[PDB]
Amino acid sequence: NSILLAAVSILSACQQSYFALQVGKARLKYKVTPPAVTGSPEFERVFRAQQNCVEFYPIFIITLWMAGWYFNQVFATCLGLVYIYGRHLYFWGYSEAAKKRITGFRLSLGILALLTLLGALGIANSFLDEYLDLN
Amino acid sequence: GNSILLAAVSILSACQQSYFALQVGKARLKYKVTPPAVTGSPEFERVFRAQQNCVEFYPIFIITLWMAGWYFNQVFATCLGLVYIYGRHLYFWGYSEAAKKRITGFRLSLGILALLTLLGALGIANSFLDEYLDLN
Amino acid sequence: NSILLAAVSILSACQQSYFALQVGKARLKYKVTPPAVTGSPEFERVFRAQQNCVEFYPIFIITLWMAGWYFNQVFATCLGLVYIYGRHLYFWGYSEAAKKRITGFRLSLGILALLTLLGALGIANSFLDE
User: Fold this and answer.
1) Dihedral angle over CA of C21, B27, A15, B61, nearest 10
2) Which of A17, A41, B20, C94 could form a disulfide with C101 if both were Cys (CB 3.0 to 4.6 A apart)?
3) Does A82 touch chain C (CB under 8 A)?
């Protein structure tokens, strides 16, 4: 009864690990020796992109589960997949040029807002179930 | 279900975190910091670092929030959760004005976090001694 | 029952807060004035280590719970403990020298992939009988 949410969650976790791998590969390709994170423009775009993704990850997960638990698992699950796609655009877009990140960024933040909305409605509706009203 | 209050707080805090990210985006435009760079303007640098410290601790807050709410008391955890959200509001805007103006909101939100950790640890412990060692 | 998962989760959250404390201590030891995060090489090692940990934390939590819920709580719990240990090695290793991070890094990523695997099997096996 959370099996769909669980699946999306494992998919997104693999995406985030994939992004971390690219930064590791970029460190070798452009000779950026740890702990440094600057010194090659190509590396800096890859690093910053991965950083923005990893920052937003827990926000996506919460919003995903609250929507799926309190509104509809199937609908949240589908939005979740489109979000995973949006960041795929964002990451690879940025990596090529800072201005190519904007599509994937707008898509994934649109989805996140909708998930927030659905989660808020469902939680509200669900709160009225201890006032016995179901709208 | 018996997580409805936790769920509400969680959605509120997630909105706060997205709001912080928006401010960094606005600051990038106001102080002309060309991506992927995050240095150059001191005003931008304070806003960026503040949002970074918030986003780092966010998953730690969520775990501690739910463990406290699940294994100790949902209503008590829920209330602390709201005050934490407020403390982070002070921290972020405080830091944005001056590096030393962050300290109030910092102490508040980390105090709460420690208490939530405490409650979570007790409840989990009590539940563990009741479930594998038959001691409540 | 999720009491074992709950315990590991609170343990790891304490580790993460501990790492953040060390960065705070490093700011004072090497005079790195906020909001700056560069200058002292040793500080940059401590900071980057804590940053790699805090990035991967939500990934560990999700995979930990999915494995524990859909595969086995006791087995996931044990792997969870080994991950916590691997991160302990990573952090302190890296703090001394970038090349001392490698052991704790391999250990913790081994665990993470297995947790992902177990979670995926359990969810699948789970979905195979509707």
Assistant:
1) 40
2) C94
3) no
- Check if the beta carbon of residue C44 is closer than 8 Å to that of residue C96: no
B36 close to A47: Cβ distance less than 8 angstroms: yes
Cβ neighbors of C89 (< 8 A, separation 6 or more) are C103, C104, C107
| N- to C-terminal Cα separation, chain B | 25
Q: Which of A81, A92, A90, A85 is nearest to A115 (CA)?
A: A81
Omega before C34 cis (within 30°)? Answer: no
CA pair distance B16, A115, nearest whole angstrom: 15
Helix then strand count (H, E) for chain B reads 4, 0
Q: B78 to chain A, minimum CA–CA distance in Å?
A: 14
Q: Which chains touch A (3 or more CB pairs under 8 A)?
A: B, C
Residues B61/C61, Cβ–Cβ less than 8 Å = no
Domain chopping of chain A, boundaries: 1-135
Helix residue ranges per DSSP H, chain A: 3-29, 41-70, 73-96, 102-127
Token readout for C32 is 């790195």
Identify from B2, B3, B4, B48 which residue to disrupt to test chain A contact, counting A C-beta atoms within 10 A and taking the largest count: B4
Contact A2, A76 (CB under 8 A): no
Resolution (A): 3.8
By Cβ distance, the residue of B14, B34, B36 closest to A59 is: B14
Name all chains with 3 or more CB-CB pairs below 8 Å to chain C: A, B
Is C3 an 8 Å CB contact of chain B? yes
Token readout for B23 is 């401010």
Cα-to-chain-centroid distance, residue A131? 35
Using N-to-C axis directions, what is the helix angle for A3-29 and C102-128, rounded to 10°? 150
Q: Would you put residue C36 in left (φ > 0), alpha (ψ -120 to 50) or beta?
A: beta
Inter-chain touch A20–C55, beta carbons under 8 Å: yes
DSSP 8-class letter at A95 = H
Residue from C70, B11, B61 nearest A60 by CA: B11
